[PDB]
Amino acid sequence: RHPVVMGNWKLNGSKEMVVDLLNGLNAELEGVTGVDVAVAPPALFVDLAERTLTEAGSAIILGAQNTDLNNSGAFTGDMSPAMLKEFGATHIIIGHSERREYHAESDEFVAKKFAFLKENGLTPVLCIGESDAQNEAGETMAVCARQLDAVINTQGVEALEGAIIAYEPIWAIGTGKAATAEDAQRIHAQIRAHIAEKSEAVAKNVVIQYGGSVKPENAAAYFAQPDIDGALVGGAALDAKSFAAIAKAAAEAKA
Amino acid sequence: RHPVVMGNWKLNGSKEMVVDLLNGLNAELEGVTGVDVAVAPPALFVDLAERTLTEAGSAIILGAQNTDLNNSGAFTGDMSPAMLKEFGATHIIIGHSERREYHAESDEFVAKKFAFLKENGLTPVLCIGESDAQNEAGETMAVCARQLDAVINTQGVEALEGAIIAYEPIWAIGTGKAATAEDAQRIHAQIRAHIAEKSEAVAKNVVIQYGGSVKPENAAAYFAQPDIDGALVGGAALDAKSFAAIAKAAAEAK
């Protein structure tokens, strides 16, 4: 599996910040080819991001932070996969914990977004993860299996083909406290085993990303594990030198 | 009150259309004065809309269809008032029924958004309105009074200064079954009245738009009523001829 490193900018961005970060990031990756680097800016800057990446002939992939379930029609304020496709955006984060929490997005709603993305030819980056209590109560795989099963049971294991899964221990997001690479590897192998119970072909090829607090200081340790195929980066994504460092560790690690 | 005409494009837009529409729009409104015309493209096309309008030196106002409660931070997928300002967007539609129905946005949530927008110097276009059943039951004003008080009773009447209220009966939205100009006027007069029971200064100044199914063929009947200060247009906004028509009607009448 070819590693994939994705930067989720979250609610960060300004006209000047977008072009400087994308311009610099691209300079830093100037010979780096063993990783897929994607970037997800706020909806307001998807246009400026396409313009910049195009002008530079960048290979950096463009994504988005969320989607809704319609392409057009009377749905004020909604995100449309067809409109995203006009900007070349392909990797769409869905199910992030911040949305699952702040917007109360259920597994059923998230799985519906997974199917619509697939229907539209886009690549869903399905986020799954346990909370502090579930973790402590030892229900990690129970939660994970449950969230994956929302798409597997309604759509079939083959739906995961061409999808990216980002495992994020909720308590590791933004907190500075990252899971250890050994525990992360342990959860990824089980997430993989779960899918393999239904299909070995799908399981062997699905890119499972790690999403705790990946930083340049702990990246290589993660990319060293066999079942960790990349990272969904938040805070370190906002620094071209940091994100480029993380991307390189993945490229060297998986060659 | 100076009339305001706003077009809500909803989930409609493409790179070709946005440019075409906005250009045609500016052509048709060439020289028309006495109406504030506004457009709310999907967030993905605000950038395009700003560039297109500026090039045209257009006076059309830029709006957006929703907002969230933070300007920055760890809030994946949210709409930032601060980021919207960067593209010159000022009029933000909130509480629209499509978002209340589909995204289950409560009166409290919509009100927090109203407050955050004011705090960021943006202009809220507060959407209120009753369902078909609530209408049959004779609950129209109870519902508009409830949705409005969520702001009034918490932020005070003064909070409505500088904001726009769009009264839209849910059953008239994209149905072609529009409210008569007389009902619309009845309701707008009672909303204004409800407000004047706390401040007549605020009440006589607040712009109240009608939502239902405004079309070029029925716009002036509405714009003749004294308490209808403009219109929030959906379908007729996706065409330059129609929407410029509606805008011209408001200018003439007021």
Side-chain angles (χ1 to χ4, degrees):
Chain A
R1 294 169 306 269
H2 188 81
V4 184
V5 166
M6 176 147 203
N8 173 14
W9 297 5
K10 304 186 180 192
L11 216 63
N12 298 285
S14 75
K15 291 172 182 193
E16 320 66 35
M17 184 269 235
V18 174
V19 320
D20 290 349
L21 177 56
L22 295 179
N23 275 153
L25 187 50
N26 195 72
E28 297 292 313
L29 292 170
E30 211 177 307
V32 180
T33 64
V35 227
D36 271 339
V37 179
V39 112
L44 264 1
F45 302 102
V46 162
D47 184 338
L48 217 205
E50 174 198 30
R51 301 215 298 296
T52 305
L53 295 171
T54 293
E55 179 176 355
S58 178
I60 297 174
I61 306 177
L62 186 63
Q65 308 182 167
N66 175 37
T67 187
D68 279 281
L69 318 172
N70 297 290
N71 275 155
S72 62
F75 310 93
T76 298
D78 280 11
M79 273 273 235
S80 162
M83 299 193 185
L84 278 170
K85 265 145 74 96
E86 271 213 303
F87 296 96
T90 54
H91 295 50
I92 310 310
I93 299 171
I94 61 186
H96 198 276
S97 43
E98 302 171 353
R99 298 226 125 227
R100 277 177 140 114
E101 177 177 56
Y102 305 133
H103 294 282
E105 307 203 353
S106 59
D107 296 319
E108 299 72 29
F109 189 33
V110 172
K112 282 186 202 293
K113 298 179 180 192
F114 193 102
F116 194 45
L117 288 176
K118 294 311 289 298
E119 283 179 55
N120 291 81
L122 299 171
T123 298
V125 167
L126 210 216
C127 300
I128 64 185
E130 87 291 343
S131 76
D132 181 36
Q134 305 180 306
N135 171 233
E136 304 201 66
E139 348 250 89
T140 300
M141 269 311 302
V143 164
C144 293
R146 190 186 67 230
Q147 296 172 325
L148 273 173
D149 279 347
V151 339
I152 291 184
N153 289 359
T154 64
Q155 309 174 41
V157 244
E158 40 283 305
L160 306 190
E161 211 197 301
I164 298 171
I165 299 170
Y167 167 58
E168 300 188 323
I170 294 178
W171 43 263
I173 290 176
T175 68
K177 202 290 146 181
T180 68
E182 287 70 52
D183 297 317
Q185 164 56 29
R186 181 205 59 238
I187 293 148
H188 285 222
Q190 300 184 253
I191 284 176
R192 207 170 300 271
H194 189 252
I195 296 162
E197 200 65 25
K198 310 227 178 66
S199 174
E200 198 182 307
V202 174
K204 300 313 201 72
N205 282 74
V206 71
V207 172
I208 303 185
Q209 296 179 139
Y210 175 66
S213 302
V214 180
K215 285 136 194 293
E217 89 258 353
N218 65 31
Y222 286 121
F223 299 142
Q225 303 309 325
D227 291 293
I228 305 192
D229 313 306
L232 180 51
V233 189
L238 265 32
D239 177 338
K241 262 82 157 66
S242 274
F243 191 57
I246 291 161
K248 292 169 178 173
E252 321 264 319
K254 310 288 181 176
Chain B
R1 318 140 209 128
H2 188 275
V4 178
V5 179
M6 170 146 11
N8 175 6
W9 300 5
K10 294 172 180 197
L11 208 52
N12 293 276
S14 82
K15 288 177 159 174
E16 25 119 25
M17 185 262 238
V18 177
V19 181
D20 284 345
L21 181 63
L22 293 181
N23 270 332
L25 217 330
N26 209 57
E28 315 286 337
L29 294 180
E30 209 258 279
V32 167
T33 307
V35 240
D36 278 354
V37 175
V39 298
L44 291 170
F45 298 107
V46 160
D47 186 324
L48 227 196
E50 168 198 38
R51 284 187 284 122
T52 301
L53 291 173
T54 296
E55 249 286 89
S58 175
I60 292 185
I61 303 175
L62 193 57
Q65 312 174 16
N66 183 34
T67 186
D68 279 306
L69 301 172
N70 323 85
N71 279 326
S72 78
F75 305 102
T76 296
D78 285 9
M79 270 278 239
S80 166
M83 296 189 197
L84 278 162
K85 272 169 169 278
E86 226 185 332
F87 297 90
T90 47
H91 294 224
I92 326 300
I93 300 166
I94 55 167
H96 194 276
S97 68
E98 286 160 16
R99 295 207 70 77
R100 296 184 181 249
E101 255 58 38
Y102 305 133
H103 296 280
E105 302 199 350
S106 67
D107 290 339
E108 215 208 342
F109 194 28
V110 178
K112 273 165 181 285
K113 296 189 172 179
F114 189 99
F116 194 47
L117 285 188
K118 287 310 238 60
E119 185 201 300
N120 282 284
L122 279 324
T123 289
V125 174
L126 178 72
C127 292
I128 66 174
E130 95 290 349
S131 72
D132 191 41
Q134 293 164 326
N135 185 75
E136 277 310 301
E139 298 182 72
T140 302
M141 279 298 310
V143 172
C144 305
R146 181 205 94 216
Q147 300 178 317
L148 212 53
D149 286 347
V151 180
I152 294 178
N153 290 171
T154 199
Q155 298 161 47
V157 242
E158 326 266 276
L160 298 169
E161 38 192 19
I164 299 175
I165 295 157
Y167 165 67
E168 306 193 297
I170 299 175
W171 46 267
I173 291 180
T175 56
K177 202 292 96 173
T180 70
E182 316 289 338
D183 297 325
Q185 163 63 39
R186 185 251 316 325
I187 310 171
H188 284 219
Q190 314 211 272
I191 292 163
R192 200 175 294 283
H194 181 265
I195 301 178
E197 210 269 310
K198 291 196 195 80
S199 167
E200 310 206 62
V202 167
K204 60 199 177 197
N205 288 135
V206 68
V207 163
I208 306 189
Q209 311 178 311
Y210 165 71
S213 284
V214 183
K215 290 193 85 275
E217 4 297 328
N218 64 44
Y222 290 118
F223 300 138
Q225 308 306 324
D227 294 84
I228 300 188
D229 312 311
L232 185 68
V233 196
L238 265 20
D239 174 64
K241 296 303 291 283
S242 312
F243 190 62
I246 296 171
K248 277 190 285 290
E252 129 240 275
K254 306 286 162 181

